[PDB]
Design a protein around this motif. Structure first.
Motif, PDB file in Angstrom:
ATOM      1  N   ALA A 112      -7.183  -0.519  -5.151  1.00  0.00           N
ATOM      2  CA  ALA A 112      -7.110  -1.033  -3.793  1.00  0.00           C
ATOM      3  C   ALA A 112      -6.604   0.045  -2.860  1.00  0.00           C
ATOM      4  O   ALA A 112      -5.634   0.731  -3.177  1.00  0.00           O
ATOM      5  CB  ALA A 112      -6.198  -2.228  -3.743  1.00  0.00           C
ATOM      6  N   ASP A 113      -7.265   0.179  -1.711  1.00  0.00           N
ATOM      7  CA  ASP A 113      -6.917   1.184  -0.716  1.00  0.00           C
ATOM      8  C   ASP A 113      -5.867   0.660   0.252  1.00  0.00           C
ATOM      9  O   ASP A 113      -5.125   1.438   0.856  1.00  0.00           O
ATOM     10  CB  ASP A 113      -8.163   1.616   0.048  1.00  0.00           C
ATOM     11  N   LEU A 114      -5.826  -0.663   0.407  1.00  0.00           N
ATOM     12  CA  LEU A 114      -4.825  -1.339   1.234  1.00  0.00           C
ATOM     13  C   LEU A 114      -4.335  -2.614   0.544  1.00  0.00           C
ATOM     14  O   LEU A 114      -5.075  -3.231  -0.233  1.00  0.00           O
ATOM     15  CB  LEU A 114      -5.381  -1.672   2.628  1.00  0.00           C
ATOM     16  N   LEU A 115      -3.090  -2.994   0.835  1.00  0.00           N
ATOM     17  CA  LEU A 115      -2.485  -4.192   0.260  1.00  0.00           C
ATOM     18  C   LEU A 115      -1.841  -5.028   1.352  1.00  0.00           C
ATOM     19  O   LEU A 115      -1.074  -4.510   2.171  1.00  0.00           O
ATOM     20  CB  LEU A 115      -1.458  -3.838  -0.827  1.00  0.00           C
TER      21      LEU A 115
ATOM     22  N   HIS B 118     -13.804  -1.183  -6.160  1.00  0.00           N
ATOM     23  CA  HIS B 118     -13.446   0.226  -6.312  1.00  0.00           C
ATOM     24  C   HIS B 118     -14.511   1.016  -7.088  1.00  0.00           C
ATOM     25  O   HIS B 118     -14.990   2.042  -6.610  1.00  0.00           O
ATOM     26  CB  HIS B 118     -12.077   0.341  -6.989  1.00  0.00           C
ATOM     27  N   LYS B 119     -14.899   0.520  -8.263  1.00  0.00           N
ATOM     28  CA  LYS B 119     -15.925   1.168  -9.087  1.00  0.00           C
ATOM     29  C   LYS B 119     -17.322   1.245  -8.448  1.00  0.00           C
ATOM     30  O   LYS B 119     -18.115   2.140  -8.772  1.00  0.00           O
ATOM     31  CB  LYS B 119     -15.979   0.529 -10.481  1.00  0.00           C
ATOM     32  N   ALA B 120     -17.618   0.329  -7.524  1.00  0.00           N
ATOM     33  CA  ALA B 120     -18.859   0.379  -6.747  1.00  0.00           C
ATOM     34  C   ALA B 120     -18.751   1.380  -5.573  1.00  0.00           C
ATOM     35  O   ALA B 120     -19.692   1.546  -4.789  1.00  0.00           O
ATOM     36  CB  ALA B 120     -19.220  -1.022  -6.232  1.00  0.00           C
ATOM     37  N   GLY B 121     -17.588   2.016  -5.441  1.00  0.00           N
ATOM     38  CA  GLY B 121     -17.375   3.081  -4.469  1.00  0.00           C
ATOM     39  C   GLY B 121     -17.031   2.584  -3.087  1.00  0.00           C
ATOM     40  O   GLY B 121     -17.142   3.329  -2.113  1.00  0.00           O
ATOM     41  N   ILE B 122     -16.601   1.327  -2.995  1.00  0.00           N
ATOM     42  CA  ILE B 122     -16.369   0.701  -1.692  1.00  0.00           C
ATOM     43  C   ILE B 122     -14.877   0.661  -1.389  1.00  0.00           C
ATOM     44  O   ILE B 122     -14.066   0.424  -2.289  1.00  0.00           O
ATOM     45  CB  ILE B 122     -16.963  -0.745  -1.636  1.00  0.00           C
ATOM     46  N   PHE B 123     -14.527   0.923  -0.131  1.00  0.00           N
ATOM     47  CA  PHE B 123     -13.172   0.704   0.379  1.00  0.00           C
ATOM     48  C   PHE B 123     -12.744  -0.755   0.144  1.00  0.00           C
ATOM     49  O   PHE B 123     -13.388  -1.682   0.634  1.00  0.00           O
ATOM     50  CB  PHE B 123     -13.123   1.039   1.873  1.00  0.00           C
ATOM     51  N   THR B 124     -11.654  -0.944  -0.599  1.00  0.00           N
ATOM     52  CA  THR B 124     -11.224  -2.270  -1.046  1.00  0.00           C
ATOM     53  C   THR B 124      -9.858  -2.646  -0.471  1.00  0.00           C
ATOM     54  O   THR B 124      -8.886  -1.920  -0.642  1.00  0.00           O
ATOM     55  CB  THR B 124     -11.221  -2.344  -2.590  1.00  0.00           C
ATOM     56  N   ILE B 125      -9.801  -3.779   0.220  1.00  0.00           N
ATOM     57  CA  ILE B 125      -8.540  -4.358   0.675  1.00  0.00           C
ATOM     58  C   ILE B 125      -8.113  -5.468  -0.283  1.00  0.00           C
ATOM     59  O   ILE B 125      -8.869  -6.426  -0.525  1.00  0.00           O
ATOM     60  CB  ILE B 125      -8.662  -4.908   2.120  1.00  0.00           C
ATOM     61  N   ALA B 126      -6.916  -5.330  -0.851  1.00  0.00           N
ATOM     62  CA  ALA B 126      -6.348  -6.379  -1.690  1.00  0.00           C
ATOM     63  C   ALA B 126      -5.453  -7.313  -0.886  1.00  0.00           C
ATOM     64  O   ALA B 126      -4.629  -6.873  -0.082  1.00  0.00           O
ATOM     65  CB  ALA B 126      -5.589  -5.804  -2.879  1.00  0.00           C
ATOM     66  N   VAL B 127      -5.636  -8.613  -1.102  1.00  0.00           N
ATOM     67  CA  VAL B 127      -4.776  -9.630  -0.514  1.00  0.00           C
ATOM     68  C   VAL B 127      -4.056 -10.367  -1.650  1.00  0.00           C
ATOM     69  O   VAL B 127      -4.692 -10.949  -2.518  1.00  0.00           O
ATOM     70  CB  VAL B 127      -5.590 -10.608   0.358  1.00  0.00           C
ATOM     71  N   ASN B 128      -2.729 -10.328  -1.651  1.00  0.00           N
ATOM     72  CA  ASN B 128      -1.965 -10.853  -2.784  1.00  0.00           C
ATOM     73  C   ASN B 128      -1.592 -12.328  -2.626  1.00  0.00           C
ATOM     74  O   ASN B 128      -0.430 -12.660  -2.375  1.00  0.00           O
ATOM     75  CB  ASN B 128      -0.718  -9.999  -3.022  1.00  0.00           C
ATOM     76  N   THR B 129      -2.588 -13.205  -2.779  1.00  0.00           N
ATOM     77  CA  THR B 129      -2.394 -14.642  -2.561  1.00  0.00           C
ATOM     78  C   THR B 129      -1.887 -15.359  -3.818  1.00  0.00           C
ATOM     79  O   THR B 129      -1.452 -16.504  -3.743  1.00  0.00           O
ATOM     80  CB  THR B 129      -3.679 -15.342  -2.040  1.00  0.00           C
ATOM     81  N   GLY B 130      -1.965 -14.685  -4.965  1.00  0.00           N
ATOM     82  CA  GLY B 130      -1.483 -15.230  -6.235  1.00  0.00           C
ATOM     83  C   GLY B 130      -0.008 -14.950  -6.480  1.00  0.00           C
ATOM     84  O   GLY B 130       0.668 -14.367  -5.626  1.00  0.00           O
ATOM     85  N   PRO B 131       0.504 -15.364  -7.654  1.00  0.00           N
ATOM     86  CA  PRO B 131       1.933 -15.259  -7.962  1.00  0.00           C
ATOM     87  C   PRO B 131       2.401 -13.882  -8.454  1.00  0.00           C
ATOM     88  O   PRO B 131       3.610 -13.641  -8.508  1.00  0.00           O
ATOM     89  CB  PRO B 131       2.117 -16.303  -9.067  1.00  0.00           C
ATOM     90  N   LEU B 132       1.462 -12.993  -8.790  1.00  0.00           N
ATOM     91  CA  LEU B 132       1.786 -11.724  -9.463  1.00  0.00           C
ATOM     92  C   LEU B 132       2.199 -10.545  -8.560  1.00  0.00           C
ATOM     93  O   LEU B 132       2.124 -10.625  -7.332  1.00  0.00           O
ATOM     94  CB  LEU B 132       0.670 -11.312 -10.447  1.00  0.00           C
ATOM     95  N   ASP B 133       2.632  -9.461  -9.202  1.00  0.00           N
ATOM     96  CA  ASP B 133       3.161  -8.270  -8.535  1.00  0.00           C
ATOM     97  C   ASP B 133       2.069  -7.474  -7.819  1.00  0.00           C
ATOM     98  O   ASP B 133       1.015  -7.200  -8.395  1.00  0.00           O
ATOM     99  CB  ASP B 133       3.884  -7.389  -9.572  1.00  0.00           C
ATOM    100  N   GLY B 134       2.348  -7.088  -6.573  1.00  0.00           N
ATOM    101  CA  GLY B 134       1.415  -6.331  -5.726  1.00  0.00           C
ATOM    102  C   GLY B 134       0.940  -4.978  -6.241  1.00  0.00           C
ATOM    103  O   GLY B 134      -0.129  -4.497  -5.848  1.00  0.00           O
ATOM    104  N   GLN B 135       1.727  -4.371  -7.125  1.00  0.00           N
ATOM    105  CA  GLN B 135       1.404  -3.066  -7.706  1.00  0.00           C
ATOM    106  C   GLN B 135       0.159  -3.059  -8.590  1.00  0.00           C
ATOM    107  O   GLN B 135      -0.509  -2.031  -8.698  1.00  0.00           O
ATOM    108  CB  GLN B 135       2.599  -2.507  -8.499  1.00  0.00           C
ATOM    109  N   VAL B 136      -0.155  -4.200  -9.210  1.00  0.00           N
ATOM    110  CA  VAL B 136      -1.295  -4.286 -10.133  1.00  0.00           C
ATOM    111  C   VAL B 136      -2.647  -4.212  -9.394  1.00  0.00           C
ATOM    112  O   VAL B 136      -3.653  -3.761  -9.948  1.00  0.00           O
ATOM    113  CB  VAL B 136      -1.167  -5.512 -11.087  1.00  0.00           C
TER     114      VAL B 136
END
Length: 223
Positions: free
Chosen positions: A205-208, A181-199
């Motif tokens: 993240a532009d997509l989740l 995000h800080k490098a100015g790039i469109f970022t897709i988040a993939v929630n493969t870990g145990p935590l909440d998607g909102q973080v």
């Protein structure tokens, strides 16, 4: 714009390899053995960082001081032995299928990782044949700071001869989402870990997506 895209910038841990349980296990244990309390859950909060950055931050939180260079090298050596003592990490389901789509679209696969794990890095070619090249990768060896610094994603663009609007970032880690995000790039988040998607969304993240397979399944229908 989907039409401007030239390259897809993949994180490795928790995106290409299912290694995050091993990382959190190894960090927990090496810290325990050194005398520091780092839970497996807390170790996941350092997802994305380099080993040196993780160690120093753990020292600051627990002991109120910096880790020395000796402590960093010694602890990182032990973390690596522990990590490599588990049966080798396997591919994340959907990663290979996605890489195949990405390449058939004429886009350039890249790896942007805080990892210094030579076992994983040397296994990229054997798990994703013909996808990646060392001159189109950013690793622990390239960076001074790493994620959440935009440093490594900025280095990635440079290496690929890309502008920020010509790339997409695939990340599992809040700190890596933040860096993309800080490098100015469109970022897709993939929630493969145990935590909440909102973080991941809070981080930039532009997509989740809930998994690599569902990102792979939705790849032709996003822009």
């Amino acid at each position: 714009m989907r039409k401007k895209l030239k390259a897809v910038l993949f994180d490795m841990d928790g995106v290409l390899f299912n290694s995050m349980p091993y990382h959190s296990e190894a960090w927990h244990q090496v810290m325990k053995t050194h005398g520091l309390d780092l839970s497996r859950e807390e170790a996941y909060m350092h997802a994305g960082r380099t080993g040196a950055s993780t160690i120093n931050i753990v020292f600051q939180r627990e002991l109120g001081k910096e880790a020395t260079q000796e402590e960093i090298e010694s602890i990182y050596h032990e973390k690596s032995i522990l990590f490599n003592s588990y049966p080798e990490a396997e591919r994340m389901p959907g990663a290979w299928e996605l890489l195949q789509k990405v390449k058939s679209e004429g886009l350039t696969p890249m790896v942007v990782t805080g990892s210094g794990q030579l076992s994983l890095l040397e296994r990229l070619e054997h798990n994703f044949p013909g996808m990646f090249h060392k001159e189109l990768m950013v690793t622990a060896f390239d960076v001074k700071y790493g994620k959440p610094n935009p440093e490594p994603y900025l280095m990635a663009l440079k290496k690929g001869g890309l502008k920020a609007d010509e790339a997409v970032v695939i990340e599992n880690a809040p700190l890596g989402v933040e860096a993309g995000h800080k490098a100015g790039i469109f970022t897709i988040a993939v929630n493969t870990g145990p935590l909440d998607g909102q973080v991941l969304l809070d981080a930039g993240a532009d997509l989740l997506f809930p998994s690599m397979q569902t990102l792979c399944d939705s790849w032709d229908t996003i822009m």
